[PDB]
């Protein structure tokens, strides 16, 4: 019976894109069961799965994601390719970004006329993807331009709003705060990203309600759980 409840840890800027309401509602039902979804940073996202308080973690974060795994607390990874980046800003776009051919190109062009950018600075799979790009651009961002804020994808578009700045974000976040919490643009668009889902390790945990993590995670990647995510 449904209090009956799964729980799973996610990232605030999952929850931001609104995917888990329409995702998760056939799953509720045929199981007659409840899941709560527990959005906090990704780095408590993967302690709460290490302490056993959840029964499923859903992040975007591979390196955190293998680690986990590699550490016994997560069993049954699966991919849920879901998402994409794209580059925001002010509708006038001063550094000319809508003229990049690559996300790569468009950081560049942001480091040389030194625009304002805001990077989420935190431990999250936006970040890291963040720092690939740089990377890919053979540039390392140093200078007054390059902020690095330390919180999730929602105030970092606030605070982007706020400076008209540019940021990366996810599409999904941004569609969810897009006209009513920013008057940013995307500027630059690309493929999906790889969010993993994992049960709890019931070896490690024994009272995590691994059956039903495992009937979650076998949803989210069947049909069903793939065209609500296609449609999304
Ligand atoms: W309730
Ligand atoms: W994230």
Same mark, same amino acid.
């Given at each position: 019976n449904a209090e009956e409840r799964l729980k799973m840890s996610t990232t605030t800027s999952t929850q931001d894109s609104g995917l888990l309401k329409v995702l998760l509602p056939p799953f509720e039902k045929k199981n007659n069961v409840k899941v709560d979804v527990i959005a906090v940073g990704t780095g408590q996202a993967l302690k709460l799965g290490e302490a056993g308080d959840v029964d499923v973690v859903f992040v975007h974060a591979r390196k955190l994601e293998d680690k986990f795994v590699a550490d016994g607390f997560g069993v049954n990874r699966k991919d849920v390719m879901y998402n994409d980046f794209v580059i925001v800003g002010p509708k006038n776009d001063p550094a000319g970004i =809508?003229? =990049?051919?690559?996300a790569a190109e468009a950081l560049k062009l942001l480091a040389t006329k030194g625009a304002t950018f805001i990077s989420?600075?935190?431990?999250s799979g936006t970040h890291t993807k963040e720092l690939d790009l740089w990377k890919s651009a053979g540039v390392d961002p140093k200078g007054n331009w390059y902020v690095e804020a330390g919180q999730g994808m929602g105030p970092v578009i606030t605070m982007a709003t706020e400076r008209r700045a540019y940021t990366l974000t996810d599409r999904g976040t941004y569609n969810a705060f897009k006209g009513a919490k920013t008057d940013l643009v995307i500027l630059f668009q690309g493929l999906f990203n790889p969010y993993g889902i994992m049960a709890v390790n019931p070896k490690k945990f024994?009272?995590?309600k691994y059956d039903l993590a495992m009937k979650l995670i076998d949803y989210v990647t069947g049909p069903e759980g793939l065209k609500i995510i296609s449609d999304y």
């Open positions: =809508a003229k =990049a051919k690559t989420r600075g935190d431990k024994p009272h995590v």
